[PDB]
Amino acid sequence: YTMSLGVENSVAYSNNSIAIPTNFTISVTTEILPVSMTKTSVDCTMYICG
Amino acid sequence: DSTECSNLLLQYGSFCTQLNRALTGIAVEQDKNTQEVFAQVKQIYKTPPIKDFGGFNFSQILPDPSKPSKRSPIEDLLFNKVTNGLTVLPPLLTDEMIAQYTSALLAGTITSGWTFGAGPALQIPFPMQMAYRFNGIGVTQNVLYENQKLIANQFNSAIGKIQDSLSSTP
């Protein structure tokens, strides 16, 4: 299929209407960030030659 | 298509696998880059039919319904001014999809300010949004409301000069 970018939304804009939130949601979201790799070393001489 | 060359190439191990893997990683990373830049909102916003934004004029940055690609004049100017086993993979997002994402971002920031970036899009008149932004830099609201037509004229002139400067400087 041709993917949808998102659900269509029409904001009811006018020059004298404002939307004020009467409530709130305390949301917690996760963010995963890699920090380090495995510290590896290679013995070049013994890798190439044994 | 040389069979003897390929027979010799099998003696070199998985170099080809490494190169294809690295290029595939780059290829998926490009799409990831485009997603992270543009696909920041999951609601596709549209501008209202009536372009009454308190004198502010966004025609140069809003999409042109006359064009088949639905690009803005500035976007169309940008696209006009930028011109053996190898395959070019098309990007995941087409130019039309990136234009729709940019259009959604523009519609959200015009009709709702910064509210659509932190949750549900909250409609607000544009001179009042710009008065909030004036508050955000330490300038009181009355400085904006008493000079609203002048600020709108300066904004429109600056947008037009941006279009001209892009068009005239290679």
Next chain:
Amino acid sequence: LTGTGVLTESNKKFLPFQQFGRDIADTTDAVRDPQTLEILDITPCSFGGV
């Protein structure tokens, strides 16, 4: 077949036709010795960085 390492008793159940064992790197991991048919575990003696 030439190699360097320690020769120990092995608990790897070889098949009767199977004579030597294999790892990823193709350096020999186990063998069945001649004259005895006994299966020896081959591990290269300790290395590391100084």
Next chain:
Amino acid sequence: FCGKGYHLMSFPQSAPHGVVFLHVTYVPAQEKNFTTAPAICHDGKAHFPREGVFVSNGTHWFVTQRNFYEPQIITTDNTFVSGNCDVVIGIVNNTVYDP
């Protein structure tokens, strides 16, 4: 930068070869339409909100903070005066209570 919504605080969690952040955010909910004005005209003076925004629930005009509906009587304490009513485009007429 610290999650979707208005950031409140974050909590780090150690992970194998990485870090996980628990971003606590304030996400507004249950929005309600209102009629708004840029300023309130009172005795030939223009009143602008000091911290909030002028809203109307249909009959009365209040001032509320922008991120949470909390209507209050438009007073001289929570509004500041600047100029007259002849300059601001869209100003509406309402009384400003004085304590």
Next chain:
Amino acid sequence: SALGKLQDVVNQNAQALNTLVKQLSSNFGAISSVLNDILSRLDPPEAEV
């Protein structure tokens, strides 16, 4: 798939290590990929090649 980024880092590092280890089994146009066989089979002027 929540921890996909760390798992991707681990998989790429392990896979690169495994590919590096597997490259020791390629002869690169020589007679054998084992140095001991080349040493025990050939005279030095060809063993050097």
